[PDB]
Amino acid sequence: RRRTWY
Amino acid sequence: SHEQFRAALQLVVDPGDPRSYLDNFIKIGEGSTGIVCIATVRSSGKLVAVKKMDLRKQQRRELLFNEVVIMRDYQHENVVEMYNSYLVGDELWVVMEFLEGGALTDIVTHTRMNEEQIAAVCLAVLQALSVLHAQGVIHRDIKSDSILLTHDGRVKLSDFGVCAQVSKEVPRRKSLVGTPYWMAPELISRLPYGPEVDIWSLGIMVIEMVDGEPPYFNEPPLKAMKMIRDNLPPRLKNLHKVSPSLKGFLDRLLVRDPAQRATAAELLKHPFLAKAGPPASIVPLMRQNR
């Protein structure tokens, strides 16, 4: 998965 | 409280609504923060990009201010230029430079790059990073998706949505931020960290450029992070497919100890970057040319 975290 | 934050954003953004001068919004892209569209400037026929971010849909709403700080203060040849910011209903819109060559991701997943091309990209990214780091700005989300190209093969860093600043008074950051597979071990280990994390992330992007994927990409995100934190530096799938010069370069990037990892300014002097070709060498890799 190519999704960012905060 | 959403209304509270809209009001806050309004005092910081440009007045007005860009819809008054923009036609033909077409969605081209995505992220965690929101969507990216192409729009036509009515009077000129020129194309710009418009980043739209719904205020209600952010994990950390206060990070939307990053977009404005970078616009106001940190413009550079290898950094996507932002023109204006607006509050449009419940969304922040950033009107910015359109990079028509698309993202490095589409290249990485569809062709093989030679070392002249890899070095060109690394040098462009490192020129950006050394200037950003020298001013205390850490990107925190370096990966091929964050690297955009012009049609004539120029390479620009984008998506500063999760960036942060260090200084004498705030020497380190602590937030868990980024994309699992690209995250530095010290950041995953929840240690205080600085600009070094971008250097690790670039190393993972070198592996992307060689293998087409970051390490442990077939593992669940949470398992991948664990392996990044616990195990020795991740290796290339195909070590015979890199020159010793490229291997020497990557060895300076994928160092577990942040204090031993090379800095962006040091890396600009690495022999491997001597192989970097002109922007023109990147051009054939793009979808419209393959």
Author numbering:
A (entry chain B): -3 to 2
B (entry chain A): 300 to 589
What does the paper say about this structure?
Most kinases in this group, including those in the mammalian Ste20-like (MST) kinase family, are Thr selective (Miller et al., 2008), while members of the p21-activated kinase (PAK) family are Ser selective (Rennefahrt et al., 2007). To understand the structural basis for how the DFG+1 residue controls phosphoacceptor specificity, we determined the X-ray cocrystal structures of WT and F461V mutant PAK4 catalytic domains in complex with consensus peptide substrates incorporating both their favored and disfavored phosphorylation site residues (PAKtide-S and PAKtide-T).
To understand why kinases with a β-branched DFG+1 residue favor Thr, we examined the cocrystal structures of PAK4F461V in complex with PAKtide-S and with PAKtide-T. In the cocrystal structure of PAK4F461V with PAKtide-T, the phosphoacceptor Thr methyl group stacks snugly against the mutated DFG+1 Val residue, positioning the phosphoacceptor hydroxyl in an orientation similar to that observed in the WT PAK4-PAKtide-S complex. The phosphoacceptor Thr appears poised for phosphate transfer, and thus the combination of Val at the DFG+1 position and Thr at the phosphoacceptor site seems to be highly accommodative to positioning an active-like conformation for the phosphoacceptor hydroxyl. The PAK4F461V cocrystal structures therefore suggest that Val at the DFG+1 residue favors Thr over Ser because the additional methyl group allows interplay between the DFG+1 and phosphoacceptor residues, correctly positioning them to promote an optimal conformation for phosphate transfer. Furthermore, mutation of the DFG+1 residue was sufficient to invert phosphorylation site specificity for both kinases on both consensus peptide substrates and peptide libraries. In contrast, PAK4F461V could phosphorylate BADS112T in cells, but WT PAK4 phosphorylation of BADS112T was substantially reduced.
